[PDB]
Amino acid sequence: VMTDPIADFLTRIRNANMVKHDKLELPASKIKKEIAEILKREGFIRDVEYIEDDNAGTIRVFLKYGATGERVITGLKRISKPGLRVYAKSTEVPKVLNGLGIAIVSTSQGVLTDKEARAKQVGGEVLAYVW
Amino acid sequence: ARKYEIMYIIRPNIEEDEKKAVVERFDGILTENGAEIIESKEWGKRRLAYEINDYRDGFYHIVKLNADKADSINEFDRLAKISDDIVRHMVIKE
């Protein structure tokens, strides 16, 4: 059965990148909103829209490629799996690809990236690595 | 509740007076049991495709039933195999 809806978000984007698909849509959730919204802030995804329906709504994401078809996202990874959750202190927040990537952290002040977390001295659950 | 359909063959060397004696007899034994008969029809003399017993032809009969306990077909089956007048019989449900 479905045991990790966040992992599906991470892997659906990865599966669409390989075949250069220009868009995708998937069932919506509150936590997926920030993750999808965060990616738009650093240009990892070209756009995002919400569709309201009966069950839970629907979200579609517009993937982004450079001129002459280079991927903008070269990898997505899930860290804190349901089988082994991980937590990071204020000084333990990593730097994905030596600052050229980002990490999504679910702090007590909201879901925000690794760079912003070290500016507020808070920790939380590390959710994903995007580079 | 559940309907059946019985075909049985009577020996060819039988006479009209005694042929209808067994047709009314086998129609009877389906009645005191839990069944109500619908249609007793006879095709007539036919040539058997193979020599089933010492005979070569036979009279064909058709019976329709609406049975519930499904034991009136058991009594027919029990007494059809034992009489010397019926040479074959078959019960079909649809």
Binding site: - | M7, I9, Y50, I52, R88, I92
Partner: protein
């Protein structure tokens, strides 16, 4: 080439209908293969239950000389 029972709208095959079944066996009483008669897969199964039922009541022969 064309299924007989589907084209004619037949939905039930009876074992008392000897004249219909005689078109679906060979000269020796053997059931013809489906690639020869052209009948569909669904009604090939119903057809053989009719033939096997009628063989027992001596309406069709088992093996014919």
């Amino acid at each position: 080439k064309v299924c007989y029972f589907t084209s004619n709208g037949i939905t039930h095959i009876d074992y008392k209908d000897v004249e219909l079944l005689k078109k679906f066996v060979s000269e020796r009483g053997k059931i013809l293969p489906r690639r020869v008669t052209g009948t569909s897969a669904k009604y090939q199964r119903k057809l053989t239950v009719a033939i096997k039922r009628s063989r027992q009541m001596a309406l069709l022969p088992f093996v014919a000389e």
